[PDB]
Amino acid sequence: GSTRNGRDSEAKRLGVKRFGGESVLAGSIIVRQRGTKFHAGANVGCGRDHTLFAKADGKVKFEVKGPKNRKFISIEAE
Amino acid sequence: MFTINAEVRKEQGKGASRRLRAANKFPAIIYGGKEAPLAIELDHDKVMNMQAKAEFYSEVLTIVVDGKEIKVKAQDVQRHPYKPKLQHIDFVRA
Amino acid sequence: MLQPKRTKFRKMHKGRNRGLAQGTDVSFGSFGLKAVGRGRLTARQIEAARRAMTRAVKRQGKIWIRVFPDKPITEKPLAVRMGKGKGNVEYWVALIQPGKVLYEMDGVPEELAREAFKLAAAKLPIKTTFVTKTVM
RNA sequence: UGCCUGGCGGCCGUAGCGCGGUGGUCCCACCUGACCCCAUGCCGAACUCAGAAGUGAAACGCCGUAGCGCCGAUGGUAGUGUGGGGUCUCCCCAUGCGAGAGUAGGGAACUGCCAGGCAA
RNA sequence: GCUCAACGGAUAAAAGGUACUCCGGGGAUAACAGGCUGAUACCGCCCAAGAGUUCAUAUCGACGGCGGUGUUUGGCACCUCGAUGUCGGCUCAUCACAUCCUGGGGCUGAAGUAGGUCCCAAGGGUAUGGCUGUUCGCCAUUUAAAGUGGUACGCGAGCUG
RNA sequence: UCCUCCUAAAGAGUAACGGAGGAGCACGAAGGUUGGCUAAUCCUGGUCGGACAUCAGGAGGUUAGUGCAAUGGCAUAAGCC
RNA sequence: GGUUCUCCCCGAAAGCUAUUUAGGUAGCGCCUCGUGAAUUCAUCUCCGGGGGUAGAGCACUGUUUCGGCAAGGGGGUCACGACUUACCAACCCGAUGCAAACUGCGAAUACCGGAGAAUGUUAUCACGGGAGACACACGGCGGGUGCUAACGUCCGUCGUGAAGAGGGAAACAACCCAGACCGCCAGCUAAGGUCCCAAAGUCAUGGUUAAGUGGGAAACGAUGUGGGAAGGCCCAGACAGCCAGGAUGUUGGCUUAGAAGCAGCCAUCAUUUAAAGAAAGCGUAAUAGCUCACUGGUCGAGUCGGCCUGCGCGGAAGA
Predict the structure, then answer these.
(1) How much is the CA Rg of chain A, to the nearest whole Å?
(2) Fold for the domain defined by B1-94
(3) Strand F positions closer than 7 A to protein CB
(4) How many domains does the structure of chain C reveal?
């Protein structure tokens, strides 16, 4: 007979690129993600694609803050 | 008037408790009060023949261990899911 | 033929049948029909083992069926090559792990409930056993 | 220093609700008046302003209570990394890691900076 | 300024036939046969609802279950495309047994004669004609019986066409 | 050709004529900023007015919304004005 | 299709991407040669991480069974209105399962990064010369698909084959053991083996099997047999034999034809008593009829029925 599926897309290569304590030079993408699964914290910016880019050549560190426990991404400064 | 002669477990884990269960024995534990939970090892065919009596699951037991007497009830018990036997019994020290 | 009503998706994957069961203790009834073998029961096999079991206990008493199919089985027709899509759904199976209490029964004596599950278990492709409601 | 209270946090349900009680000189809340500053897709209800008669009702803070939420062992069970095995659509043994659910149980948060009140 | 959508777009611009066929390759890839498989087909069992004047089990066995076989229809594409010739008939066969006949038994809802169903048994036996290319089928008339299948759906360096 | 989910075996990637759906746009505000605001659906009471319009109160909590499929996100709202 | 002398060193790929491309080719991945570089890299321990799979759970999205409460709904009954009401049943509550496109939970591993020690012929990276290859095969694990069919197909990852001889699996690329520089009429072992073909135990001890099992196969069947855990009935006398009774009014009802100890409904009596069930099946047109149950006599010591496990038996038919 016939089929109606067989269609997908270029896998977007998302996820975290730089993990925990791992020195990142300013402007380095850390998390490439759909929505704000991981939120931007200290010294880390958020782009127009919810890519949290580093902003200060330092470390990383994820956390949980407020009263929603949203992994948060900060940048220890070394 | 239910007396169960038991022992103290000295190895514990997945491999320790499956070796122990193929030797016609099974592990148990006494816990409660404010003290340490004592890991209890006792013979299977006795306690499997005890639990048919309906006053095992309601009235106060005495587990004999180390020469001591410890008055317990029975709180939680694991059947083997397709064999008529046991794996583990929770005894509340009371 | 016990069959789900308005499922999410028509065709699902095959899947493995690993692990132990969940309907281990007899909850609703007094006597149960527990599985020992790992197989799967179709909706025609649940319903044939129920007619052979309702009949022996002449209808008074009460019977609980602890399994429902909710898994579709596709089937390629004859004289059809491989490929060209998944097959169309023909029947619905329930997956049975060892230990699954299949049927239960209450309101009949201990020997008629014994001598009705054996007439029911001859209709099942899995090896079952007889269990009774145990305290705790 | 000790209580009460207000701002700003730390933390993020052991901290949340429910239920019972409780507080006004301070503070806070409602409250009083609005022609104006400003304000309502109508309405000073809100926002805003000018004041202080009244009440602690609401709300808020504190207290008490486990009725729920939540926290939560030890033991066992499931799973599985590596190496062997079997009556091999599934399992077992040696070894390492070892949950989830449930049980005992805990639990009516704690705490920093400043300011005001009141007692010392 | 292009559904250059055959969307990394061969040209601005392009459909068919070949049984008159031809060349280069391929068992990398189909038809035949073999293999693997057993969905299917076929044979045997399991449960026992019911039918059988009553009585499930003389006989039949629903709803469902478990197998065997490799005989069907298929799946796959492993051998063969530097060639494994094919349907049916002829001639000659050969083995299996799931036995059609003959032979020996059990049960019978078996008086006898004749059956039904079942187990044991492969020694030998196992029609001629009408029609059709037919195997099958139908028909006429026999026979103790006119068995079912494997053998490249046996058999074209044996014949036929 | 492109996008979303699963298969995909908890980094990314991953195939089949595998299982499901969508795109070939819209918008000069539906973009920017500042200032405010909080849904869905039931419940009762209420003129025409009913299962359902608007009004009021309660329960409820984001089960709503998001120009458009699906996933991730969203109260500081990215939702509404 | 074929491609002609020798030795030495290293030694792949059958992948991705694009292609009027799919059996071709191009870049990249893997290979080789040369040059240049950083404890560069690999293993491990320790530390920082991110998950969301296996499992689990059912708050959500869907499915699902049971009971309770229950709107509504449905049946039938009434005189503009409702009354009786054999039934269907949402939201909640309590219990119960299921999910690749469910998640209020959540591993192992794997991965990224940092520190440190040992080890490894720099094993690492970058650039330059030359390639080949882009038909993969099987096996384990995780899956899709198919029939939880195929020496099927399609990805993931590891191994072997390819391109790897040797020993083993009777023979058997792809399985188990193990990686062939050369020679020796030397020794130790692995997988697998030790009665003969055929090198080595007719080894020692302790059980099992009667089937040629071992040396094919299921549901299911059965006083085959060995070990175990509990029971019932028993030398105030059982179990199987062997002699008596095995019944009285119950033609009891039932639509009023008959069910009658043994038909549908049933209750499931109570006297007579050591003992009889208003009957378990055999008789029947309904009865009549043999019958054990339930009782002693006799008898003389254990017997019966379940369960868990070891090994066997049947189910078992091909050219």
Answers:
(1) 16
(2) Ribosomal Protein L25; Chain P (2.40.240)
(3) 2-8, 11-22, 71-74, 76, 78
(4) 1
